[PDB]
Design a protein around this ligand. Sequence first.
Ligand SMILES: OC[C@H]1O[C@@H](S[C@@H]2O[C@H](CO)[C@H](O)[C@H](n3cc(-c4cccc(F)c4)nn3)[C@H]2O)[C@H](O)[C@@H](n2cc(-c3cccc(F)c3)nn2)[C@H]1O
Ligand SMILES: [Br-]
Length: 138
Amino acid sequence: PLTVPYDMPLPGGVMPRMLITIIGTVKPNANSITLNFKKGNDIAFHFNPRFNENNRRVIVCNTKQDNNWGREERQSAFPFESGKPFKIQVLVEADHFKVAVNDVHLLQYNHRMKNLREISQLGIIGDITLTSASHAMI
Ligand SMILES: OC[C@H]1O[C@@H](S[C@@H]2O[C@H](CO)[C@H](O)[C@H](n3cc(-c4cccc(F)c4)nn3)[C@H]2O)[C@H](O)[C@@H](n2cc(-c3cccc(F)c3)nn2)[C@H]1O
Ligand SMILES: [Br-]
């Protein structure tokens, strides 16, 4: 039984060819979801679907370094729905993270924090129920 917030440990951090698969369901009347690829107090990759930001559904991605957020990357393609099952897949490549939702490519996020093997945890928070959270080398 996975409960949210959930911290998925990453003993070897992240590396090219690592695929992270997160399966769950969006809670009814969801407000937001967050995936945080963490390196201590820093967030190498923050993936944040917002269901109601000024009456708009938008995905915000960013990096938090030295308690400061960088430039936001915004994506209006929004494959999540309240009360509906989801599958988020994050493929780690040498230059970026590739995110897909329900087997459909969603976005690419270029690495800002290049020490990938230092990302020791994946935090999964927000208005979701979690079925599984796993990683594999593909
Ligand atoms: O970058 C991502 C960060 O975003 C800020 S919100 C951010 O605030 C900034 C303040 O300067 C700007 O307002 C920024 N913004 C909006 C627009 C804009 C411009 C035009 C139209 C339009 F619509 C919008 N432009 N710039 C906002 O997105 C969240 O707090 C932060 N976060 C939140 C939490 C957090 C929250 C709850 C629980 C928890 F555990 C953690 N943990 N990290 C994280 O998600
Ligand atoms: Br977190």
